[PDB]
Paper text:
One specific mechanism used by nairoviruses is the production of a deubiquitinating enzyme, termed the vOTU, that disrupts the innate immune response. Interestingly, the nairoviral L segment also encodes a viral homologue of the ovarian tumor protease (OTU) at the N-terminus. Instead, the vOTU’s primary function appears to be the reversal of post-translational modifications by ubiquitin (Ub) and the Ub-like protein interferon stimulated gene product 15 (ISG15). Each vOTU possesses a seven-stranded beta sheet as the core feature, with five major alpha helices framing the rest of the structure.
Numbering used by the authors: 6 to 156
Write the structure that this text describes.
């Protein structure tokens, strides 16, 4: 059992050390700048090939539900600013889209930080759920995300 500490809006955080293979199997995503969206696409569609649809749905939720996205507001002026920056191909996904997707899909999203391919040393969570029901991502160096499936 894990103690989540509230950070901001629907975002919380946990310092915790564990072997991620103790609780997860990993699925690698293609190492390009779309890796975040490929990991979410795997969760949603059981293939990484739908990363473009994940980018689209984030943009669309930003335009219809801008009022609900204070973490996105920290970095982008309005939905059009978000849409322009995310439509470029060297756009890297991350905590902005984890907030969007947690609220669009009514799901919990968790980044598990791992720097040696063995030990997780930190979790960051959007939503109130536990990891069994969450989109779990392995966040490693160079802003790469792989997908984690709970055992």
């Amino acid at each position: 059992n894990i103690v989540w500490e509230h950070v901001f809006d629907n975002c919380s955080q946990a310092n915790v050390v564990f072997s991620y293979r103790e609780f997860f199997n990993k699925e690698l995503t293609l190492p390009d700048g779309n890796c975040f969206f490929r990991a979410v696409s795997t969760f949603l569609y059981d293939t990484q090939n739908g990363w473009i649809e994940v980018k689209n749905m984030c943009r669309e939720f930003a335009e219809t539900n801008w009022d609900e996205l204070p973490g996105v507001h920290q970095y982008f002026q309005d939905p059009e600013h978000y849409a322009r920056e995310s439509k470029r191909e060297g756009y890297w996904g991350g905590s902005v889209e984890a907030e969007i997707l947690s609220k669009l899909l009514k799901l919990t999203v968790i980044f598990w930080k791992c720097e040696d391919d063995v030990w997780v040393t930190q979790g960051i969570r959007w939503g109130d759920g536990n990891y069994l029901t969450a989109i779990n991502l392995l966040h490693i160096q160079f802003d790469h995300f792989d997908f984690l499936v709970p055992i």
